[PDB]
Design a protein around this nucleic acid. Structure first.
Lengths: 56, 141, 218, 82, 129, 26, 180
RNA sequence: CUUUAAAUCCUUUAACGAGGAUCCAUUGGAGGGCAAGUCUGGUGCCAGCAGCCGCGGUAAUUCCAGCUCCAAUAGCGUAUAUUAAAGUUGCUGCAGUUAAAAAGCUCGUAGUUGGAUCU
């Protein structure tokens, strides 16, 4: 029941700096982009209905 | 069966009113013993002073030491055990500092592994634990 | 190539039966899914309601089979439900699709208030029961849609019901009983005697009698 | 059956039991539709006509299909009085 | 003991219709029972019936046409205004296209549609569909 | 496609059980 | 005591199920088709349609010859055909129940100035309205959710001070022409 | 200018004001419920996560991070109280053989209920 280890994993996690990327769209433009990605073309599909974040 | 008569309104209402007392939620919310035994006194949050840091052992299926703090509430001097949610967040707490403590989300019930702990620390030294956790704010000096 | 095994299958293949409704009119059991493919197999959509792993305890382990609950039906006036259990999920789904085709029933649609246009809701309040699960369908005004849980909503949409109120009681968490109860409620739509069905029935020639010569000579 | 405009909007008109008038369902496989051959009154032979009686599966389960069919035939003149 | 002879009559009719019988015997009879049966008949739900006169209280042999789904009594006889009639119709009737709620009003015993036509409330006796 | 079906039959009551059963149809 | 009025109301309803995939796809399709900003606009038009439908149902449960039914049904149908959602030939109470959400979304100023050829797309229509380039009759209208009446459809011009309809060059054109 | 008792704000006019248009949107999540990754690195029943079920004991879809993804969006999370969900207070409309439950058994006043019949 020792409290000696309290920030063990967060303390020992190798710090990685977030990259620099161009800003995401906001408001109506982001919704337009989502609608375009999901309803305009069938390029990102396979007939198997894969997921948006498929790492395979 | 139940009474179905044009003049049975009094009997039906009385039966409903007596039988409501056999509902645990109704009896809890309409007796006053639960309100008087509630450490917060019916409030949503309460400020207290940390008396010590404790490590509560998780329930039997799991194995961990949940970092909590014994805090004495300013409103009534009652001693409670408040969970310090995130990791390394017990390091942000020092002895005899003021912490704002909320419920654990289950309305007087223990939550998850932590046995008998129904409160969690929300603020320490007038700074939220989440602001200290993400580096947004630093402990007052 | 479909080679019929029953008299009804032979009559359907030889274009003697002109619709599913003549088969329904005489309550004949449909035992070949190719009949359903012939009559509706251009608008039927299938949907796997659930894959449920069931287990049988044995001496040296649990034998695990998978039960596929699959709803089917063109989204106009016809719906079926099929439950098939097998050691393989794909085989279970195939069997469940076949069984849902075999159990397709006609759905009677009615009007909530005034009768302008096509029927859009159930003709009356119907109730289906399956193992403590009670599902009640109540006629709803046009444009309200299906006010139901997702499991009965799928079947009500595949039945062609445009709008309907529903009530559920019991252990609806068991998807199989929930689906079977709403299927019973849907199938009871045409078994309900409403005053527009009081007209005496004009009996016609049954498919086995009206094309007996064709069956003999083919 | 009928909408306001008067056109018939049903998929089909289910038949009713000749005994109980209750609707025979689409998956009532214990229901029967039996034809009784009509006979020429002088020759006593099949004239090509028949009387059609539909009995639902409930009546057949109750064992009342015999009585119901006998009564339907009696009312049609098929069965002699008494 | 026996109370609400209309309840017993409607229960007998319902149980006989469930059994597929062509006739049902109702005893004892009453003015309310006869009026309810007449309201039922004008809508074609039961067909003709005969009142057997025994010199204490009547009996009724009701011919049954298998058009009746449910006949029921509403006990107690709640007093119903024209405003609450729609709520009662929604609760008790299977559809807005058929089914009748029978009420006793000062104009007599009649279905809910005739009560609306005569612009009167009353006490709900029962329903049939 | 059948990848989820096949990995489900390996461990019907494993860690990746509710996920795969839902991924089949939901 | 203050003269202030506290009368207000929420103009939308949050869905009961937050993560229903079919509802998400339908709302996203509406948003993309009509160039809306968020789900709250879809829910707003849904709330207006639902309130109209509820009023229509309540009137329909009345007696046909009841004077309140005549008066309020006539007013409701008149408003619906005034904003163009309801056809003048279809002016019965039960024809209100058959209206969709796209019927009301079509009457938005954004959709109208996209349809009348004023903008190249629906998002260009939104940015045109928000940038004070569109006027209804003589009034410069700045709200894309502005619901256009039938009698106001024929007057949607390109403003008299807009660079597209009034010929005063904008900041960018003037600044570029200065360097030229 | 207008506003207003001086004023401010909104509205109106002119000037300057946008290419990382850096004039840089966030809050929670990504096993199921419940939408969205068994991608990579770290840790190794520890630290922690987790409303619930559960994840973590060297290949963690669940901790800590990076990336990517989705949910609402100038908002979003948390605690408490409360309403619906709850037909889990049941008048509508629940239950009481075995899941919680009919008094050991009758009598009995108030209470509730009460057969046909009169144009």
């Amino acid at each position: 029941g020792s409290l000696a280890r309290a920030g063990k994993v967060r303390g020992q996690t190798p710090k990685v700096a977030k990259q620099e990327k161009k800003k995401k769209k906001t408001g109506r433009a982001k919704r337009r982009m989502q609608y375009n990605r999901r309803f305009v073309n069938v390029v990102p599909t396979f007939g198997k209905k894969k997921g948006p974040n498929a790492n395979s | 069966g139940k009474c179905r008569g044009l003049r049975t309104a009094r009997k039906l209402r009385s039966h409903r009113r007596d039988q409501k007392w056999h509902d645990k939620q109704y009896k809890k919310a309409h007796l006053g013993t639960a309100l008087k035994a509630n450490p917060f006194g019916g409030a949503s949050h309460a400020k207290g002073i940390v008396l010590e840091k404790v490590g509560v052992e998780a329930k039997q299926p799991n194995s961990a030491i949940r970092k909590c703090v014994r805090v004495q509430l300013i409103k009534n001097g009652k001693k409670i055990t408040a969970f310090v949610p995130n990791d390394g967040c017990l390091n942000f707490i020092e002895e005899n500092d003021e912490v704002l403590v909320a419920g654990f989300g289950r309305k007087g019930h223990a939550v998850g592994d932590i046995p008998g702990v129904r409160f969690k620390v929300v603020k320490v030294a007038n700074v939220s634990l989440l602001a200290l956790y993400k580096g947004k704010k630093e402990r007052p000096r | 190539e479909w080679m019929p095994v029953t008299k009804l299958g032979r009559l359907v293949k030889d274009m003697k039966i002109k619709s599913l409704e003549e088969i329904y009119l005489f309550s004949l059991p449909i035992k070949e899914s190719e009949i359903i493919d012939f009559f509706l197999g251009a608008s039927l959509k299938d949907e796997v309601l659930k894959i449920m792993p069931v287990q049988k305890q044995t001496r040296a382990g649990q034998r695990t089979r998978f039960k596929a609950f699959v709803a089917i039906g063109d989204y106009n006036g016809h719906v079926g439900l099929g439950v098939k259990c097998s050691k393989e999920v794909a085989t279970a789904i195939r069997g469940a699709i076949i069984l849902a085709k075999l159990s397709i029933v006609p759905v009677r649609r009615g009007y909530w208030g005034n009768k302008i246009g096509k029927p859009h809701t159930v003709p009356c309040k119907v109730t289906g029961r399956c193992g403590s699960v009670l599902v009640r369908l109540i006629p709803a005004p046009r444009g309200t849609g299906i006010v139901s849980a997702p499991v009965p909503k799928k079947l009500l949409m595949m039945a062609g019901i445009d709008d309907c109120y529903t009530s559920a009681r019991g252990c609806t968490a068991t998807l199989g009983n929930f689906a079977k109860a709403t299927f019973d409620a849907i199938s009871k739509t045409y078994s309900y005697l409403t005053p527009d069905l009081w007209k005496e029935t004009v009996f016609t020639k049954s498919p086995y009698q009206e094309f007996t010569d064709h069956l003999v000579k083919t | 059956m009928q909408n306001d405009a008067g056109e018939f909007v049903d998929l089909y008109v289910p038949r009713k039991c000749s005994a109980s008038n209750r609707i025979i369902g689409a998956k009532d496989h214990a229901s029967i539709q039996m034809n009784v051959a009509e006979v020429d009154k002088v020759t006593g032979r099949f004239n090509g006509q028949f009387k059609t009686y539909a009995i639902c599966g409930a009546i057949r389960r109750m064992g009342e299909s015999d009585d119901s069919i006998l009564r339907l035939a009696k009312a049609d003149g098929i069965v002699s009085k008494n | 003991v026996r109370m609400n002879v209309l309840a017993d009559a409607l229960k007998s009719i319902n149980n006989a219709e469930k059994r597929g019988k062509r006739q049902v015997l109702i005893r004892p009879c009453s003015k309310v029972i006869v009026r309810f049966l007449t309201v039922m008949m004008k809508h074609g739900y039961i067909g003709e019936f005969e009142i057997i006169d025994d010199h204490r209280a009547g009996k009724i042999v009701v011919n049954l046409t298998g058009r009746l789904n449910k006949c029921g009594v509403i006990s107690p006889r709640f007093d119903v205004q024209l405003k609450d009639l729609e709520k009662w119709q929604n609760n008790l009737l299977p559809s807005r296209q058929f089914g009748f709620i029978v009420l006793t009003t000062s104009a007599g015993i009649m279905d809910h549609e005739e009560a609306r036509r005569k612009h009167t409330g009353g006490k709900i006796l029962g329903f049939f569909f | 496609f059948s990848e989820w079906i096949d990995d489900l039959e390996a461990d019907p009551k494993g860690k990746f059980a509710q996920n795969l059963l839902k991924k089949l149809t939901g | 005591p203050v003269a202030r009025s506290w009368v207000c109301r929420k103009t939308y309803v949050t869905p009961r199920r937050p993560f229903e995939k079919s509802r998400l796809d339908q709302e996203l399709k509406l948003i993309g088709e009509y160039g809306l900003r968020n789900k709250r606009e879809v829910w707003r038009v849904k709330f207006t349609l639902a309130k109209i439908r509820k009023a229509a149902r309540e009137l329909l449960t009345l007696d046909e010859k009841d004077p309140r039914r005549l008066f309020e049904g006539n007013a409701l149908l008149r408003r619906l055909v005034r904003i163009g959602v309801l056809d003048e030939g279809k002016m019965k109470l039960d024809y209100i129940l058959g209206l969709k959400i796209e019927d009301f979304l079509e009457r938005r100023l954004q959709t109208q100035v996209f349809k009348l050829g004023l903008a190249k797309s629906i998002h260009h229509a939104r940015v045109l309205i928000r940038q004070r380039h569109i006027r209804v009759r003589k009034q410069v209208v700045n709200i894309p959710s502005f619901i256009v009446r039938l009698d106001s459809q024929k007057h949607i011009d390109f403003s008299l001070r807009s660079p597209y309809g009034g010929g005063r060059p904008g900041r960018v054109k003037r600044k570029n022409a200065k360097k030229g």
